């Protein structure tokens with residue numbers, strides 16, 4: 125009980141949730157984004173990332189930087205669709 | 217609502233307070249992040265792009281003595297590439313980086329609420345002392361900067377397509 | 390709120406007490422370090438740089454009779470001159486630092502005695518008799534020391550690039566390249 129208080133970063137909120145979905149503070153800067161916005165973002169990100177990955181699957185000695193960058197949208201789309209769910213079930 | 221896009225709801229973040237606010241955010245990019253940060257970025261882009269457009273025209277019209285020898289027939293990004301080797305772009309980068317470190321301090325102040333976005337207290341000639349004149353000037357600055365972003369995009373991409381600077385292109389087409 | 394950077398808040402430490410303060414500390418060094426130590430460092434740098442800039446300018450024109458001391462370029466002179474003399478200068482400078490500070494020469498110990506920053510007691514001719522005169526001079530020492538820091542930096546770098554002395558490089562600017 126004599127342990128020193130644990131320092132945490134500024135503006136650290138309570139994100140623990142036993143509800144159906146988290147509190148939308150889990151999404152940080154994107155907490156106010158709409159569920160429809162997240163859905164469209166996830167679909168667009170998935171399509172663009174899949175296309176840019178296919179444009180690089182037989183990787184050459186000189187891959188395109190824009191295709192490399194856009195390939196990172198496929199992992200991004202997962203987070204986006206998870207957020208869409210969270211924001212749909214948080215009321216938005 | 218959304219006067220700009222009449223079939224969409226007014227953006228939640230945009231309440232119409234800021235200059236040049238016509239409720240334009242169809243994709244809802246103001247919801248993500250802080251609107252003060254986005255306004256600082258927008259004004260930075262506005263000023264930089266209108267300087268860039270005026271510079272494109274002025275480089276097309278006039279060139280400083282002895283620059284023709286260094287750059288040959290290069291225009292626009294060709295001039296950029298030619299003078300990176302020379303070192304002019306390096307010096308510009310050094311000095312702009314100095315100014316941008318201080319602008320980083322300014323942005324940190326803005327996010328804390330101390331500084332209005334895009335306000336660096338730069339008013340040597342004293343224009344805008346009168347509040348109404350300052351408001352008019354702010355709206356004109358935002359509108360001209362947006363027009364200039366679009367104009368510089370058009371100029372650079374017209375150079376890409378044709379290889380001709382803005383006014384040299386306009387002369388012949 | 391800062392006289393020098395009007396779009397930034399005034400540094401908390403800088404309140405106009407010390408001469409030469411125009412509220413210029415954009416990076417917040419004063420908050421992290423002792424302002425007295427910072428001023429001591431500033432004045433030491435300015436004095437060394439003033440002496441250095443005058444040294445380069447006088448060197449390029451006036452030389453000692455010996456060959457080893459006949460290099461118009463200061464950077465090349467540093468290596469042409471005997472190393473024993475340079476190390477003697479180093480040791481004498483170390484002794485002067487030791488004595489002038491009083492052996493208390495550290496962030497925590499230098500100002501235990503309470504001497505004002507930049508005051509090592511060196512006023513042989515007693516030119517500080519008049520308080521008003523001392524004040525303005527105090528600012529000049531600062532302004533001129535800052536100017537000399539920047540000027541000597543320019544001199545040495547322009548001696549690296551051109552390979553000539555300060556004024557020779559200034560007057561031999563290559564306008565046609």
Ligand code: CLA
Nearest residue numbers: 407409410411412413414418419427428430431434535538
């Ligand atoms: C090493 C030299 C040095 C030192 C120790 C100081 C110390 C001080 N100055 Mg500064 N000053 C200097 C050089 C120095 N100055 C020079 C050369 C100038 C002329 C431009 C000034 C001009 C000046 C003014 C006008 C004022 C001060 C003030 C102050 C005080 C408060 C600000 C502060 O904390 O600065 C501490 C600063 C440093 C320790 C320097 C840090 C350097 C960083 C780490 C790297 C810099 C790299 C490079 C040189 C920058 C350009 C990079 C480029 C390539 C992009 C403090 C006592 C204020 C005052 O009087 O307060 C009482 C004040 O109003 N100074």
Ligand code: KC2
Nearest residue numbers: 280281282283284285286287299302303304305564565566
């Ligand atoms: C008014 C201000 C001014 C500006 C802002 C400016 C900017 C630039 C830039 C931009 C970054 C470059 C890259 C550049 C390059 C060259 N300048 Mg130039 N310059 C200015 C003025 C003069 C004057 C008066 C002269 C001159 C010259 C040369 C020569 C020599 C070539 C050679 O002789 O082979 C070259 C290569 C001399 C010359 O030849 O002029 C016929 C000459 O007398 N410049 N100049």
Ligand SMILES: CC1=C(C#C/C(C)=C/C=C/C(C)=C/C=C/C=C(C)/C=C/C=C(\C)C#CC2=C(C)C[C@@H](O)CC2(C)C)C(C)(C)C[C@H](O)C1
Nearest residue numbers: 266267269270339340341342360363364367370371382385
């Ligand atoms: C604020 C302030 C000051 C200041 C200042 C300064 C220096 C202010 C400078 C303001 C500037 C330089 C404004 C430039 C605006 C340019 C625009 C809108 C360009 C549009 C181009 C278009 C639409 C285009 C195009 C085109 C396209 C796309 C295709 C091309 O083939 C050609 C074509 C042309 C047809 C001062 C000094 C007074 C002091 C005061 O105390 C503080």
Ligand SMILES: CC1=C(C#C/C(C)=C/C=C/C(C)=C/C=C/C=C(C)/C=C/C=C(\C)C#CC2=C(C)C[C@@H](O)CC2(C)C)C(C)(C)C[C@H](O)C1
Nearest residue numbers: 439442443512513514515536537540543544555556558559
């Ligand atoms: C302590 C004390 C006393 C004292 C004293 C003394 C001895 C005081 C001595 C003070 C001195 C020597 C001050 C020197 C300042 C020099 C400056 C500012 C140089 C700037 C150069 C620049 C900007 C430059 C440059 C240049 C560059 C970069 C590139 C070059 O190619 C061109 C160029 C040259 C233009 C006394 C004896 C009265 C006793 C009293 O009790 C108090």
